[PDB]
Design a protein around this nucleic acid. Structure first.
Lengths: 11, 63, 103, 213, 63, 102, 125, 94, 230
RNA sequence: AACGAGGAAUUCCUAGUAAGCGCAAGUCAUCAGCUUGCGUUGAUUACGUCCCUGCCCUUUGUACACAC
C-alpha cells in the first residue's frame, strides 16, 4: 500500500 | 504535508493537469474548492521556481 | 634505514624511512627547503626524500658508478645538488629536471 | 598618518608573567603557538559545522554540547578531535592525557609540513567526510544497498571518527604511539594520498554508493 | 567529476520513509532556480549546504 | 478567557486544576495553544484552544513564572522565572526538551 | 582603610575566594604565583581572565586567591572563575563603570562560564 | 552617554578621559595644528574632529580605526554637531 | 646500471592475517559451507550426508544440503596452491549457520577426511585451533561480519554460473597496485548465487560449464599466479 | 594443561550519562564470597521518524467563536 501523496504523483 | 512531497517536475505537469480540467466545466464546479485549495498551496510553496523558469506555454497555461 | 627524528628527545623515533637495503652512509637535510631530505646509500643511488611521504622517495637520483659516500647542497640554487661518487667524477644534478642524468 | 595610543606606561607586574605569555595577549593562539587567523575551511558546505572562528587557548572547553540537537557543531574542532581520542575502556575519562597528545601531535605536523597544524586538521576533516553514503533498504526480506546523500553534520562526525580510529588502530602494536600515527593520518588525509586510513575508507563509501543508485 | 552543492530549503514531514533516512527539498547553490528532492542520511536542518555527487537523479521513497 | 472580536463573546474560559492565580500569558501564533503562568503554582499551564482542557502542566521552575512568550518563527516558548533562570521550552512534536539559561 | 572586593568562583565542589585589592600587580594562588599552577597544560585555562581583557588592567591590583575542594581540573575552573569575577567586580566598585561593561562584554564573547556558574543540575526526562 | 570626556589640545592630541574616575583611556593623534572642535555621534559609533590645518577627520570609536579624512580649504574655528540627524556645521576662515 | 639487493638469501614472505590490512593479496572465501555439530549418546561428530543419512531426517534439514566434504575438497585446493606458498592469499570460511572462520595460511589441514571431521569439531567448540608448534593460533572463529576483517581497499566478487564469463588474468591486471581481490565462492552443491548479494559489488563468471567449488578456486588461483608472475 | 581481548546469539544504554579511579562507612530487613554511600577525571552517537517490531488511542467535532 502506497503512502498518500506519492500515489497522487504516479497517478 | 503530502503535496509538498513532490518534485517541481510534477508541478509543471500539475499545472497542465488543471489546464485541462478548465475545459471540462462539469468537473470544475463539482470540485471547485478542492482545485482552488491545491493550486494555491502549490504555487505559494513552489513560487520561486515557477516564476524563474521561462516558457511561453506556461504563460499560455496560466492565463 | 635512515631514522629521522627530533633532537633533544632520544625516545621518539619520529620517522623511520626505510631507505635502500644497502647501507646508507650519508643522510643530510636540504639547506634551503627545510622539509626535503636527501639520503645516499651504498646502493649508488641518492634519494631525495620528502618527509611528508616517508614511504616513497620523491626522486631517485642516480647514474653513479661506485659508492656515493657524500652529497652536499649549494646555497644559491635549491634545485641543484652536488653528489660525489667514490669512482671520482663529482656529479651535479638538477632535481627539477628528470635528474637521472647529471647536468 | 594616524596613531592610537592606548597603553601609556610599560606594564610590568610584581608577579613575573613570562615573556611568551605577555606576547600572547595580542592574538589568541592554540597551545600558545597556533593562530586561528588565516585558517580557512577550504570546502564550502562544511563551514557552520567546522567551528574555527572563535579562538581558544587549550582544547578543554567543558561546556555543554550534548543538550541540543546541533549544539555539537559549535565545539571548536580541536577539542572535538581530543574528545574522540578517549574512545576505549582503557581511555575513557582521561582528557589531560588526550590533550597532551594533541599538543604533541600538532607539533609534529609543523615539523614535517611547516604550514600550520590547525590548517591541516581542518583540511583533514574536509577530505575524509563522505559525500554519498549507502543505506540498507527493507525490500521485503532481500536487502540491497540503496545509495543516498549525507547531511554535513554526519560528514563531520564520521570524519573525526575515522581519523582517531585510524590512528588508534595503526598504532596498535608499533613503537609509534598515538601521537605520531595521528599526524601520519592528518598529513596524508590532507593530501588525500590514499595511504591513510580514512581516505581509503571514504573511497569505499563513495565507491559503493556509485555502484547502486 | 564536478560536484554541485545544494542548500536545504525544507525538510519533508509525514512522508513515509525508512528510519534513519529523511527527505529534503534542496536548492541548487550555483543557480538558485532549480530544486531536487533528495534524501539525507545524517541529521539535517534548513539553511545548511549539502553535497551532491549527481544532480539529475531525484530520489523517491525507500519503503 | 478567550474572546471574539467579530461577535464580542467568550469562546471558552480556560481554568486550571486547583484554581491558581494567573499573571501572564503566551499565545501560539498559530492559535492552537494558550500558556499561562502564576505566582501561586510556578507551573506553566498549557491549554488547547479547541478543547478547553489543559494539555499539560509544564514545570521545572523554582519560584514563580513572571512572563511567557512565543517565537513567531518556530513557536518555541521561553519562560522567565524568579529563580534567576530563563528556561526555553520546546513543546511541539515529540521533542519535549528543555534548556535552562541562568 | 584598604579598598577590597571579594568574589567567589565555583566548579564541581571547589570554591575560590578571590580577594582583590588595590596594589602593585602581584597575583597569588594559595600563597604562590599564578605561573605555578599544577596541571601545567591547563595553565592557559587560568590565563584567560588575564589575557582576554589585557594584562594592563592588573597593574594596580592584587589578586589573592585561595582554593579548596575539587580535583586538579575542577580547581582550574574555579580560579579562572573567581579572577574574572574579582576583576569585573572591582571596576564597578572602585574604578570606572565603563571599564566594567567593557570587561563584562569581553568575558561574555569569549566564554560565559568565567562569570556565572554553569550549574549542571540534573534533568529527569 | 556621559562616560567619555573629549579634550582637544592645541597640538593635535585628542585625549579621551573617562568620567567616573578621571582616568585616561585613549589618545587620538591625527591633527598637527590646533584641534578646534570634537564631537561624538548619537550612536557612540563615529567621531569627528576639525583642525586649523583644514583636516576634518572622521573616526570610528567602537574600534579605534580612522574611518576617513576630509580636507577643506580654510582653517576651521568651531564645530556644532547635530546628533539627531548626523549633520554638523563648520565655521571656516573664508 | 642497477645494483643488486644487499643480502640475496631468500626468506619467508610475511604471513598475512586479518590484522594486516594494507598489503595487496587475494582472498578466497568459501560461503555457506555445511559444517555443523551434532551430539550422539557417546561423543560429538561432524554432520555428513553420506555417513548417516537417517540422522538428518529427524533434524529436518535435508541430506542433500549437509556436505562438509566439498569444503575439505576446496581446502586442499587452496592451501597447496603456490599462491599460498608465496604468501598472497588468506582464506575465510562462512558457515551456513552464520559462523565465520578465519584460516591462517600457515596451517596444514589433514588430507584425510576423517581427521578433518575431528579437526572441525575441535574448532566449533574451543573456537581456536593452535598448532603443535604452538607459536600462534591457527583456525580462529572471528566476529561477523566479514567486511570488518577484509582489507580496506578491497574488491569483492562472486562466482556465478549465470554471470558473464570473464578471464582471470585480465581481471586482476586492471586492479590498482594496492587493491585486494576477494572471491566469495559458493560451496553449496546446489543453490542460488545470492549468498552474498549485500556484500559484493559485482558477479563474475569463470566458465560456460557448470563447475565444482574446487575447480573454481584453482581456475581463479592459477590465473592469479600467472597474473602476479609466480 | 587451561591460556595472545573472547563465536553464534543475547541484553542493557542519551550528559555530569557510558566508562575509568580510589576513599569511606555496615544503621532492627538485605549484603561481608559483598552491599550501600562519597568524591575525583568524564566522552562518542542520536535527540529524529512511525518505514519494520510491538504497545496504545480514536473513528458524534459537541465545546462556543472564526476557520477547516
Amino acid at each position: 500500500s502506497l503512502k498518500a501523496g506519492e500515489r497522487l504523483m504516479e497517478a | 504535508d503530502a503535496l509538498m512531497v513532490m518534485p517541481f517536475s510534477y508541478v509543471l505537469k500539475f499545472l497542465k493537469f488543471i489546464d485541462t480540467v478548465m475545459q471540462n466545466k462539469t468537473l470544475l464546479h463539482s470540485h471547485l474548492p478542492l482545485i482552488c485549495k491545491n493550486l494555491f498551496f502549490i504555487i505559494k510553496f513552489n513560487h520561486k521556481e515557477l516564476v524563474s523558469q521561462k516558457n511561453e506555454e506556461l504563460k499560455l497555461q496560466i492565463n | 634505514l635512515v631514522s629521522v627524528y627530533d633532537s633533544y628527545n632520544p625516545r621518539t623515533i619520529l620517522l623511520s624511512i626505510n631507505a635502500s637495503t644497502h647501507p646508507t652512509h650519508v643522510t643530510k637535510f636540504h639547506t634551503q627547503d627545510n622539509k626535503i631530505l636527501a639520503t645516499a646509500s651504498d646502493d649508488r643511488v641518492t634519494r631525495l626524500w620528502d618527509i611528508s611521504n616517508a614511504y616513497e622517495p620523491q626522486l631517485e637520483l642516480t647514474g653513479a658508478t661506485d659508492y656515493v659516500r657524500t652529497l652536499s647542497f649549494i646555497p644559491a640554487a635549491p634545485h641543484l645538488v652536488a653528489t660525489g661518487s667514490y669512482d671520482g667524477l663529482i656529479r651535479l644534478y638538477d632535481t627539477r629536471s628528470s635528474g637521472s642524468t647529471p647536468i | 598618518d594616524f596613531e592610537v595610543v592606548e597603553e601609556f606606561t610599560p606594564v610590568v607586574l610584581a608577579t613575573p608573567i613570562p615573556e611568551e605569555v605577555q606576547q600572547a595577549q595580542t592574538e589568541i593562539k592554540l597551545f600558545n603557538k597556533w593562530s586561528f587567523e588565516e585558517v580557512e575551511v577550504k570546502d564550502a558546505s562544511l563551514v557552520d559545522y567546522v567551528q574555527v572562528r572563535q579562538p581558544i587557548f587549550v582544547a578543554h572547553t567543558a561546556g555543554r554540547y550534548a543538550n541540543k540537537r546541533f549544539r555539537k557543531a559549535q565545539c571548536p574542532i580541536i577539542e572535538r578531535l581530543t574528545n574522540s581520542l578517549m574512545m576505549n575502556g582503557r581511555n575513557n575519562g582521561k582528557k589531560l592525557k588526550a590533550v597532551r597528545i594533541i599538543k604533541h601531535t600538532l607539533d609534529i605536523i609543523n615539523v614535517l609540513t611547516d604550514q600550520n597544524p590547525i590548517q591541516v586538521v581542518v583540511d583533514a576533516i574536509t577530505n575524509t567526510g563522505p559525500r554519498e553514503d549507502t543505506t540498507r533498504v527493507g525490500g521485503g526480506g532481500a536487502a540491497r544497498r540503496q545509495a543516498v546523500d549525507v547531511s554535513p553534520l554526519r560528514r563531520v562526525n564520521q570524519a573525526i571518527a575515522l581519523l582517531t580510529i585510524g590512528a588508534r588502530e595503526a598504532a596498535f602494536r608499533n613503537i609509534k604511539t598515538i601521537a605520531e600515527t595521528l599526524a601520519e593520518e592528518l598529513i596524508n588525509a590532507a593530501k588525500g594520498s590514499s595511504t591513510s586510513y580514512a581516505i581509503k575508507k571514504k573511497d569505499e563509501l563513495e565507491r559503493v554508493a556509485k555502484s547502486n543508485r | 567529476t564536478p560536484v554541485t552543492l545544494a542548500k536545504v530549503i525544507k525538510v519533508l514531514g509525514r512522508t513515509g520513509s525508512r528510519g534513519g533516512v529523511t527527505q529534503v527539498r534542496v536548492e541548487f547553490l550555483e543557480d538558485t532556480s532549480r530544486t531536487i528532492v533528495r534524501n539525507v542520511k545524517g541529521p539535517v536542518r534548513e539553511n545548511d549546504i549539502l553535497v551532491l555527487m549527481e544532480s539529475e537523479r531525484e530520489a523517491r521513497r525507500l519503503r | 478567557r478567550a474572546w471574539d472580536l467579530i461577535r464580542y463573546r467568550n469562546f471558552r474560559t480556560f481554568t486550571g486544576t486547583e484554581r491558581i492565580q494567573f499573571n501572564c500569558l503566551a499565545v501560539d501564533p498559530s492559535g492552537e495553544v494558550v500558556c499561562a503562568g502564576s505566582l501561586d503554582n510556578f507551573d506553566i499551564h498549557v491549554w488547547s484552544v479547541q478543547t478547553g482542557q489543559l494539555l499539560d502542566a509544564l514545570s521545572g521552575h523554582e519560584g514563580p513564572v513572571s512572563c511567557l512568550s512565543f517565537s513567531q518563527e518556530n513557536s518555541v516558548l521561553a519562560s522567565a522565572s524568579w529563580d534567576k533562570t530563563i528556561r526555553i521550552w520546546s513543546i511541539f512534536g515529540r521533542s519535549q526538551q528543555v534548556e535552562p539559561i541562568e | 582603610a584598604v579598598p577590597s572586593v571579594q568574589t567567589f568562583g565555583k566548579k564541581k565542589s571547589a570554591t575560590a575566594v578571590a580577594h582583590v585589592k588595590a596594589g602593585k600587580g602581584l597575583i597569588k594562588v594559595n600563597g604562590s604565583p599564578i605561573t605555578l599552577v599544577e596541571p601545567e597544560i591547563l595553565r592557559f585555562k587560568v590565563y584567560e581572565p588575564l589575557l582576554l581583557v589585557g594584562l594592563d588592567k592588573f597593574s594596580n591590583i592584587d589578586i589573592r586567591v585561595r582554593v579548596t575542594g575539587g580535583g586538579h581540573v575542577s580547581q582550574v575552573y574555579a580560579i579562572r572563575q573567581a579572577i574574572a569575577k574579582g576583576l569585573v567586580a572591582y571596576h564597578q566598585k572602585y574604578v570606572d563603570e565603563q571599564s566594567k561593561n567593557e570587561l563584562k562584554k569581553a568575558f561574555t564573547s569569549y566564554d560565559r562560564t568565567l562569570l556565572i556558574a554553569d550549574s549542571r543540575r540534573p534533568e529527569p526526562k | 552617554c556621559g562616560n567619555f570626556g573629549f579634550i582637544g589640545s592645541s597640538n593635535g592630541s585628542i585625549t579621551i578621559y573617562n568620567m567616573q574616575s578621571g582616568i585616561l583611556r585613549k589618545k587620538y593623534k591625527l591633527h598637527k595644528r590646533a584641534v578646534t572642535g570634537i564631537s561624538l555621534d548619537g550612536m557612540n559609533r563615529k567621531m569627528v574632529s576639525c583642525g586649523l590645518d583644514g583636516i576634518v577627520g572622521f573616526y570610528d570609536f567602537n574600534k579605534s580605526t580612522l574611518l576617513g579624512k576630509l580636507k577643506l580649504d580654510a582653517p576651521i574655528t568651531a564645530m556644532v554637531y547635530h546628533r539627531s540627524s548626523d549633520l554638523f556645521a563648520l565655521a571656516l576662515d573664508d | 646500471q642497477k645494483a643488486l639487493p644487499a643480502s640475496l638469501v631468500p626468506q619467508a614472505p610475511p604471513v598475512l592475517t586479518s590484522k594486516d590490512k594494507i598489503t595487496k593479496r587475494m582472498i578466497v572465501v568459501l560461503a555457506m559451507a555445511s559444517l555443523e555439530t551434532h551430539k550422539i549418546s557417546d561423543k560429538y561428530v561432524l554432520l555428513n550426508c553420506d555417513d548417516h543419512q537417517g540422522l538428518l531426517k529427524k533434524m529436518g534439514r535435508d541430506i542433500s544440503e549437509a556436505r562438509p566434504d566439498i569444503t575439505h575438497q576446496c581446502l586442499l585446493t587452496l592451501l597447496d596452491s603456490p599462491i599460498n606458498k608465496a604468501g598472497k592469499l588468506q582464506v575465510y570460511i562462512q558457515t551456513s549457520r552464520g559462523i565465520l572462520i578465519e584460516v591462517n595460511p600457515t596451517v596444514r589441514i589433514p588430507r584425510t577426511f576423517k581427521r578433518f571431521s575431528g579437526l572441525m569439531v575441535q574448532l566449533l567448540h574451543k573456537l581456536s585451533i593452535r598448532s603443535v608448534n604452538s607459536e600462534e593460533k591457527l583456525l580462529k572463529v572471528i566476529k561477523n561480519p566479514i567486511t570488518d576483517h577484509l582489507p580496506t581497499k578491497c574488491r569483492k566478487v562472486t562466482l556465478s554460473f549465470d554471470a558473464p564469463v570473464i578471464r582471470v588474468q585480465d581481471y586482476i591486471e586492471k586492479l590498482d597496485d594496492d587493491e585486494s581481490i576477494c572471491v566469495f565462492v559458493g560451496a553449496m552443491a546446489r543453490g542460488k548465487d545470492n549468498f552474498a548479494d549485500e556484500y559484493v559489488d559485482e558477479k563474475v563468471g569463470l566458465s560456460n560449464y557448470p563447475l565444482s567449488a574446487s575447480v573454481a578456486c584453482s581456475k581463479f588461483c592459477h590465473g592469479a599466479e600467472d597474473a602476479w608472475n609466480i
